[PDB]
From a paper:
In response to this pressure, vertebrates have developed equally dynamic immune countermeasures, including the capability to generate vast repertoires of immunoglobulins (Igs) by stochastic gene recombination and then improve the potency with which these bind to antigen by rapid somatic evolution. This “maturation” of antibody affinity occurs in germinal centers (GCs), clusters of rapidly dividing B cells that arise in secondary lymphoid organs upon infection or immunization. There, B cells perform iterative rounds of stochastic somatic hypermutation (SHM) on their Ig genes, each followed by selective expansion of mutant lineages with improved antigen binding. We chose a B cell receptor (BCR) specific for the model antigen chicken [name] (clone 2.1), which we characterized extensively in previous work. To understand how features of clone 2.1 phylogenies related to changes in its affinity for [name], we used deep mutational scanning (DMS) to measure the impact of virtually all possible V(D)J single-amino acid replacements to the naïve 2.1 sequence on antigen binding and Ig surface expression.
To understand the structural basis for our DMS results, we determined negative-stain and cryo-EM structures of an affinity-matured version of the 2.1 Fab (measured KD = 6.2e–11 M) bound to [name]. In agreement with antigen truncation experiments, clone 2.1 bound to the hinge-like [name] domain of the four-domain [name] constant region. Cryo-electron microscopy revealed that the paratope consisted of a concave pocket that contacted the outer face of [name] [name]. Mapping the DMS data to the structure showed that residues in the central groove of the paratope, which form the bulk of the interaction surface with [name], were highly constrained (i.e., replacements at these positions had strongly negative mean effects on Δaffinity). Affinity-enhancing replacements were found primarily at the periphery of the paratope but also along the heavy-light chain interface. Replacements that substantially decreased scFv surface expression occurred in their expected positions (e.g., cysteines involved in disulfide bond formation and inward-facing hydrophobic residues and salt bridges). We reasoned that, since most affinity-enhancing mutations in clone 2.1 were spread out along the edges of an otherwise optimal central groove, epistatic interactions between replacements leading to non-additive effects would be limited. As expected given the relatively tight binding of the unmutated clone 2.1 to [name] (~40 nM10), amino acid changes, particularly those falling within complementarity-determining regions (CDRs), were much more likely to reduce affinity for antigen than to improve it. This effect was strongest in the short (6-amino acid) CDRH3, where almost all amino acid replacements led to decreased antigen binding, and less so for the longer CDRL3, where multiple replacements at two positions (N108L and S109L) led to affinity gains.
Residue numbers in the entry:
A (entry chain A): 233 to 248, 252 to 334
B (entry chain H), E (entry chain B): 1 to 9, 11 to 30, 35 to 59, 63 to 72, 74 to 107, 115 to 128
C (entry chain L), F (entry chain C): 2 to 29, 36 to 57, 65 to 72, 74 to 80, 83 to 109, 114 to 127
D (entry chain D): 233 to 245, 252 to 334
The structure:
C-alpha cells in the first residue's frame, strides 16, 4: 500500500512559468502527503493540490507546480517526495532538464 | 536562511526532566519536515523525532511516550522533552530538518 | 533498518581517490544520502537526494550504488576533508544511520 | 460536458507519453494516437476508467521512439467521443 | 502510402438501392477511423458518415434512415448503401480516413 | 456547424505571399485543417490542426490558428500551386466545408 510516484514534464522545446506534474498512485489507506524539492532543498516550491479520488481500495492524486522558465536547461534537479505516515514509508521521484 | 541554534540545560540529574530547544532561522518551521536526532559518545547516532507542517508528529520506537516533540509557531522554535533523563541519554543532540540544514548541537551530561 | 560500514577508517594522500562502502540489510532502493562530519563545526550533509548531487556540493563526488550496497567515491581529495563520512538511509521512516568512516592523511 | 485531454511525458533527456483525459459526461469515449498528424502508427496501453462519480476519467501510455523525438516529430492524442459527437486533442512537439 | 479507391455503379435508377464500396490498399481497417464524404457539383461538400475500427457507426442526420454504412473484415473494405435516391443525389463520392488520406473519388449519376 | 469562405479566384504572381481565410459561426478553436484539391488528382490533407504540416507537406505553406477567422499563407509561390483549397472542421462529428477558393498564377 506504499505509494508509487511519477513526475512528468509538460513543456515545449522553446526555453522560457513551466508546469511540472507529480502523479501519485496506488496509495494511502488513510492519507499521505507530497513535498516538492529543488536539488534536494525543500520550501522553495508550492504546488496546487487536489482531493483524493478513491476507488475504495486505494486512491490516486497529483500536484502541479509552476517552475520558472529560466531554471530549466540550467542543470537544476527537481524532485517530488511523497511520504506516507502509515507504513512509515517515503518514496520519491527525480526529474531534470536537458541543457 | 540556514541557521539552526541548539540550546539546553547542559547538565541534568538522573531523575530531572530533560528539555532542549532549537531556534530555526530561515524559511519557516511551517515548511515542515523538521526532525530531532542524537549522536552517542561513540560514532553511532539515531533518529528521535519529526514534526509535520500540520502539527502531526512521529516518534521513534524505544522512546515511546517520552519524546513529546513540540513546536511554537510564533517563536519559530522547536523543543524536546524526554521526561526522566535516565542517565543513558548523554548523546549530542542535533536539529537537522530532514537532511537539509544541520544546525549546532550539544551534549547534556547526567551525573549525581 | 540495519546499516554498517565495511571499514571504520581509511587513509589516503592528497590528490588521490578514496571510497567508502556502505552496506545494509533489507532493501531500501536508492533512498540514501551522504554526510560530512566536521569536528568543531556544525556537521553538514551532501548527496541529499537519492544518489544525486545536492546544492553547492563539490564536483569531486556524486552518489553511486543501489538496493543493498552503496558507495562513496571522492576523487582528488583536497584541503581539509580528513573526517568521518556517514551513510544515511531514509527508505523506512524509523530512519537509521550507520557509523562514519574516518579519512586520514596517509 | 466535452472531454478535456492533456498529454505529459517524463522527458529527462523510448519515452512514455501519458494522455490524461477527464470530463466525460456520459462516461464513454475512445482515444487515438497520431504521429505528425497521421493516426494508426502507435499502439498505447489503455487503462480502464477510474469511474469517479464526477466523471469516468481515464488515461493511456505509449512508448514513442527516442530518435523520432530527437528529430522533432510531433505526437498528438486525439479523443473521439461517440455520445457527445465531438473530438478533442492535444499536441506534444517535443524538442529536436 | 495508404490509398483508397472508390468502387460502385456509374448510374443508379431513381428509388433504387445504391451501393459503393471503399477498397483500402494498406494499413488496416482495425486501426483509426474511416468515413464517407460526398461533393456536390455546386462546390459544396457534406459528411455522410463515420465507421469505427472496432465496429459501430455514426451518421449525419441529413442522411437519416436512407443511409446504411457497414464494414467488411478480411477484405479491408467498407460499403455505403442508400435505400432512397433522387436526382439531387448525383455527386462525386469519396472514401477517406478521418483527417488524413482521401481517395480519388467517383461520380454517381441518379437518373433514368 | 457552418462555414463561410467569402473568397474566389484570388490571383498571385510567382514569389508572392498569398493568403486564404475561412470563418464560422462557431468559435471552433484549434479544431481545423485544410485540403488542397488539384483537378485530376486525389485531394491531399495539407494542414493538420490549427497550424502544422502533415509529413511530406512543404514548409513554404504556413497556417495560423484562431478562435474565428482561421488563415493560411503560401509563401514564395513557385509552380503547380493552383488548386481549390478548403477549410475543414474538426470540432464536431458533423462536418462542414466552405465553398473553397481558386488560385490564379497571374
Ligand atoms: C502557472 O501560471 C499560469 C499563469 O497564467 C497559470 O495560468 C497556471 O495555471 C499556473 N500553473 C500552476 C500549476 O500554478
Ligand atoms: C515501454 O517499454 C518498456 C520495456 O520494458 C516497458 O517496460 C514499458 O511498460 C513500456 N511502456 C509503454 C507505455 O508501452
Amino acid at each position: 500500500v506504499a505509494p508509487e510516484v511519477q513526475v512528468l514534464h509538460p513543456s515545449s522545446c522553446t526555453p522560457s512559468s513551466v508546469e511540472l506534474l507529480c502523479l501519485v498512485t496506488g496509495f494511502s489507506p488513510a492519507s499521505a502527503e507530497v513535498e516538492w524539492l529543488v536539488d534536494g532543498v525543500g520550501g522553495l516550491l508550492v504546488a496546487s493540490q487536489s482531493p483524493a479520488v478513491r476507488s475504495g481500495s486505494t486512491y490516486s492524486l497529483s500536484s502541479r507546480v509552476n517552475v520558472s522558465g529560466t531554471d530549466w536547461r540550467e542543470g537544476k534537479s527537481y524532485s517530488c517526495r511523497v511520504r506516507h505516515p502509515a507504513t512509515n514509508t517515503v518514496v520519491e521521484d527525480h526529474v531534470k532538464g536537458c541543457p | 536562511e540556514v541557521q539552526l541554534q541548539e540550546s539546553g540545560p547542559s547538565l541534568v540529574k538522573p531523575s530531572q526532566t530533560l528539555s532542549l530547544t532549537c531556534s530555526v532561522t530561515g524559511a519557516s518551521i511551517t515548511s515542515g519536515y523538521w526532525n530531532w536526532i542524537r549522536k552517542f559518545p561513540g560514532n553511532r547516532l539515531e533518529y528521535m523525532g519529526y514534526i509535520s507542517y500540520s502539527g502531526g508528529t512521529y516518534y521513534n520506537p524505544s522512546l515511546k511516550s517520552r519524546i513529546s516533540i513540540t513546536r511554537d509557531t510564533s517563536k519559530n522554535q522547536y523543543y524536546l522533552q524526554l521526561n526522566s533523563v535516565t542517565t543513558e541519554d548523554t548523546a549530542t543532540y542535533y536539529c537537522a530538518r530532514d537532511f537539509d540544514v544541520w544546525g549546532a548541537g550539544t551534549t547534556v551530561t547526567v551525573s549525581s | 533498518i540495519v546499516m554498517t560500514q565495511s571499514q571504520k577508517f581509511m587513509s589516503t594522500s592528497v590528490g588521490d581517490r578514496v571510497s567508502v562502502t556502505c552496506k545494509a540489510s533489507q532493501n531500501v532502493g536508492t533512498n540514501v544520502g551522504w554526510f560530512q562530519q566536521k569536528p568543531g563545526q556544525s556537521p553538514k550533509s551532501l548527496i541529499y537526494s537519492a544518489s544525486y548531487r545536492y546544492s553547492g556540493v563539490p564536483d569531486r563526488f556524486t552518489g553511486s550504488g543501489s538496493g543493498t550496497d552503496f558507495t562513496l567515491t571522492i576523487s582528488n581529495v583536497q584541503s581539509e576533508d580528513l573526517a568521518e563520512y556517514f551513510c544515511h538511509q531514509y527508505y523506512s521512516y524509523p530512519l537509521t544511520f550507520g557509523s562514519g568512516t574516518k579519512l586520514e592523511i596517509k
